[PDB]
């Protein structure tokens, strides 16, 4: 009941070597669909999902331009920010951005946004009202002042409320086969004995999609998350996701712990325990 | 489809 379209831009300066490398990437939910990289042969916006080789040449030609347009914008921004903080020419620097829209399943825009980071630290961001900006320091304050004068916020807003939402919709259709398809988790539990005398129970969820999932180790029928170790969901490499959750348990109690895996692909949640054989 | 009416910092 919620989807989104996001564009991520990045520019990294190359001291003494010419122009910054610039990359633009587009996502529909967590699926990359378009990508631009100035390190390329002939920098062009290219598709990154099968369902994108349908858009016409007019799409690629247009999107490639807007990308190249942004690339020049970031080439100069890098210089401006370097002036703002009085940095020298020997240092490499980064500028990142992320704009997009979240859209309910009833077609309503849930939230629009556009946020910056210079050298990994927040810089300026368009508030949720789509009208005012939040600036991290003075530099981003200089920028905020230019954008209020030019009423820039009003353009992003128009975009986010219209074009962003319309194209998110188009992209859903093009790729419903893969974007709106539920791929369930395979769940199993492993045992790794500790030298402390007790044991670590590990619960793994394999080959699932999307990626939103909840692993919960419970005892006797009650939750246990302030003391449950986790790994960040990792990509399996074939387009699925996987994750593990572990708790330390006392020897002889293994069987009193279950792992609940909740996921869109599962009709009812999974209850998985240790199974020595 | 990207936003095109950009502005500089």
């Amino acid at each position: 009941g919620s989807h989104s379209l996001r564009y991520f831009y990045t520019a990294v300066s190359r001291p003494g070597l010419g122009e910054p490398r610039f990359i633009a990437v587009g996502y529909v939910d967590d699926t990359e669909f378009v990508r631009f990289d100035s390190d390329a042969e002939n920098p062009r916006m290219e598709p990154r999902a099968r369902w994108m080789e349908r858009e016409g040449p007019e799409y690629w030609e247009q999107q490639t331009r807007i990308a190249k347009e942004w690339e020049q914008i970031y080439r100069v921004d890098l210089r401006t920010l370097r002036g703002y903080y009085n940095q020298s020419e020997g240092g490499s620097h980064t500028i990142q951005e992320m704009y997009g829209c979240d859209v309910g399943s009833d077609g309503s825009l849930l939230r629009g946004y556009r946020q910056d980071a210079y050298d990994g630290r927040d810089y300026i961001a368009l508030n949720e009202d789509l009208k005012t900006w939040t600036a991290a320091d003075f530099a981003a304050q200089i920028t905020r002042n230019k954008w209020e004068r030019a009423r820039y916020a009003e353009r992003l807003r128009a975009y986010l409320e219209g074009t962003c939402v319309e194209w998110l919709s188009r992209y859903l259709e093009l790729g419903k086969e893969t974007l709106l398809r539920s791929d369930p988790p395979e769940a199993h539990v492993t045992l790794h004995p500790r030298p402390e005398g007790d044991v670590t129970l590990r619960c793994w969820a394999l080959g699932f999609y999307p990626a939103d999932i909840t692993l919960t180790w419970q005892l006797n029928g009650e939750d246990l998350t302030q003391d449950m170790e986790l790994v960040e969901t990792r990509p399996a490499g074939d387009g699925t996701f996987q994750k593990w959750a572990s708790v330390v348990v006392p020897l002889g109690k293994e069987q009193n712990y279950t792992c609940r895996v909740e996921h869109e692909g599962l009709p009812k949640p999974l209850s998985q325990r240790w199974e020595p054989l | 489809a990207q936003f095109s009416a950009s502005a500089s910092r």
Partner: protein, 99 residues
């Protein structure tokens, strides 16, 4: 203003020495974006690794998945070598068929 990477070396499909599968090394949460990543068999890099293309998380952190085909054994161990401007230690990590 630099975040050190989080290496995760694993396998696509569960370990079972024969049924050939894949070797994944997932580096994430680093910054700056420039990072060096090579896979290792018993000490020498694997020739032609395939790597996804850079990307980054909402928190401005970069991530990337180095990988290549392979067939697990009993006497062979794989590791992930990685260099970063944050890596005090040119951190090699070994594939534990348990995490």
């Amino acid at each position: 203003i630099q975040k050190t990477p989080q290496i995760q070396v694993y396998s696509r499909h569960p370990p079972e020495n024969g049924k050939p599968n894949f070797l994944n090394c997932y580096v994430s949460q680093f910054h700056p974006p420039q990072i060096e990543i090579e896979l290792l068999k018993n000490g020498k890099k694997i020739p032609n690794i395939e790597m996804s293309d850079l990307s980054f998380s909402k928190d401005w952190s970069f991530y990337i998945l180095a990988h290549t085909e392979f067939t697990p054994t009993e006497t062979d161990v794989y590791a992930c070598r990685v260099k970063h401007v944050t890596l005090k230690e040119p951190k090699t990590v070994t594939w534990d068929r348990d995490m």
